[PDB]
Amino acid sequence: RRGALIVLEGVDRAGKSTQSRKLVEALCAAGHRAELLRFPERSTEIGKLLSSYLQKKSDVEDHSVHLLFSANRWEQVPLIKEKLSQGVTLVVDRYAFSGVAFTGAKENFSLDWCKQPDVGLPKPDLVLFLQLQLADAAKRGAFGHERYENGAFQERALRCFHQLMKDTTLNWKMVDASKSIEAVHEDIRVLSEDAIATATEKPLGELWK
Amino acid sequence: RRGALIVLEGVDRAGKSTQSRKLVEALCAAGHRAELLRFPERSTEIGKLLSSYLQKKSDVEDHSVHLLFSANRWEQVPLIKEKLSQGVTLVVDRYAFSGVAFTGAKENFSLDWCKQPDVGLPKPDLVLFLQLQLADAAKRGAFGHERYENGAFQERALRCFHQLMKDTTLNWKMVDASKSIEAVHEDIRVLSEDAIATATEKPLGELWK
Ligand SMILES: [Mg+2]
Numbered sequence: 001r002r003g004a005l006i007v008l009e010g011v012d013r014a015g016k017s018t019q020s021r022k023l024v025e026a027l028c029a030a031g032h033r034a035e036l037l038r039f040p041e042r043s044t045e046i047g048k049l050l051s052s053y054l055q056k057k058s059d060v061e062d063h064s065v066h067l068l069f070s071a072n073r074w075e076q077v078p079l080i081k082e083k084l085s086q087g088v089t090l091v092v093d094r095y096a097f098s099g100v101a102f103t104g105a106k107e108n109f110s111l112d113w114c115k116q117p118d119v120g121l122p123k124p125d126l127v128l129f130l131q132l133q134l135a136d137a138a139k140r141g142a143f144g145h146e147r148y149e150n151g152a153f154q155e156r157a158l159r160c161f162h163q164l165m166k167d168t169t170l171n172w173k174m175v176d177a178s179k180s181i182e183a184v185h186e187d188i189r190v191l192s193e194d195a196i197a198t199a200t201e202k203p204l205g206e207l208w209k
Numbered sequence: 210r211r212g213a214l215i216v217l218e219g220v221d222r223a224g225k226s227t228q229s230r231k232l233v234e235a236l237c238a239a240g241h242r243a244e245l246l247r248f249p250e251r252s253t254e255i256g257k258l259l260s261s262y263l264q265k266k267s268d269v270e271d272h273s274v275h276l277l278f279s280a281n282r283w284e285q286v287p288l289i290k291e292k293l294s295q296g297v298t299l300v301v302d303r304y305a306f307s308g309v310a311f312t313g314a315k316e317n318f319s320l321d322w323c324k325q326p327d328v329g330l331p332k333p334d335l336v337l338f339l340q341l342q343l344a345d346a347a348k349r350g351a352f353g354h355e356r357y358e359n360g361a362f363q364e365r366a367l368r369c370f371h372q373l374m375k376d377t378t379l380n381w382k383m384v385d386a387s388k389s390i391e392a393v394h395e396d397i398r399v400l401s402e403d404a405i406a407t408a409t410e411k412p413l414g415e416l417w418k
């Protein structure tokens with residue numbers, strides 16, 4: 001009985017990492033086998049290049065960095081497929097959607113070109129999108145020193161996310177991330193239990209194909 | 210007056226590196242400004258990962274390595290466009306065509322998926338394909354320890370190259386690489402002079418778009 005592939009995506013300071021951690025904890029306490037993954041995965045050779053770029057410690061050509069972000073997901077595909085086949089549900093903090101939305105926010109990057117490298121990746125059974133006013137996310141700390149952490153760029157990434165949500169091949173679920181940490185968690189937990197049950201009776205799909 | 214972008218592609222031990230070096234030397238002796246480039250460019254962070262993979266010192270997931278090969282070309286695009294705009298002709302030993310043909314030789318890799326990462330790169334004004342029987346290439350040394358250096362795989366890459374040659378958007382020129390080093394060089398030199406003159410009156414194009 002395969003595990004479910006659950007991805008959390010969302011607006012800045014929307015709570016993806018907090019909710020991903022809480023979801024895995026709750027699923028395991030309820031007897032499921034579930035594990036947390038995140039992208040970028042900064043531990044690999046590619047992940048270190050990506051981490052240096054995001055910290056502004058290095059500059060990387062825009063197309064090259066886009067392809068490194070995608071390669072960073074492909075290097076984990078053998079692990080992802082093994083875990084799912086063993087019945088482990090995977091909760092993933094960011095995935096290909098962030099890859100497309102962040103590069104697609106730059107000038108002269110079509111959504112089509114941005115999607116291609118990730119075509120064929122394991123298809124999530126559930127994609128949660130944590131919605132929050134780009135401004136309520138402001139009440140939640142302040143813009144940092146990391147790349148892409150400015151309002152005008154976040155707004156362009158958000159528009160790209162809305163274009164990706166029109167894709168009916170994917171099980172997109174909107175989450176109201178303006179609520180308390182525990183209320184948002186309960187909303188995500190119930191959607192997740194349903195996906196683990198139901199969404200899993202079919203074979204793991206391929207993204208964007 | 211921009212420089213020309215000339216790529217050399219070809220069958221194993223076809224003579225790409227020898228002819229690329231000789232071409233730059235001849236063009237410069239004839240008063241042109243010309244410089245040599247090669248892919249993979251093993252000097253960058255990405256190039257070192259690629260070199261380790263090719264030497265079998267490391268294993269890399271097939272989709273990830275394909276994207277690293279493409280990223281390795283994109284990281285050089287700012288240099289390529291600057292040189293061409295300054296009137297320097299660039300002679301390139303392997304380019305996106307090798308990228309598509311070598312990954313496309315593997316199972317379950319469509320030519321379409323393989324092309325996408327390189328869509329948009331500077332379009333060569335001339336693509337030379339050095340033809341040689343996969344066997345006459347045998348009389349030229351023996352298969353080494355590097356990856357992809359076996360006959361059955363080279364044969365599948367060659368089939369992919371022939372599919373890419375059907376693309377009429379590109380100025381493909383076949384070269385009979387079975388001749389002597391000097392005869393092959395003279396054939397390549399004359400085609401190159403014509404491209405530098407003529408092919409350059411139009412703006413630099415975009416590959417596969
Ligand atoms: Mg986070």
Ligand SMILES: [Mg+2]
């Ligand atoms: Mg397409």
Ligand SMILES: [Mg+2]
Binds near residue numbers: 225226227
């Ligand atoms: Mg060579």
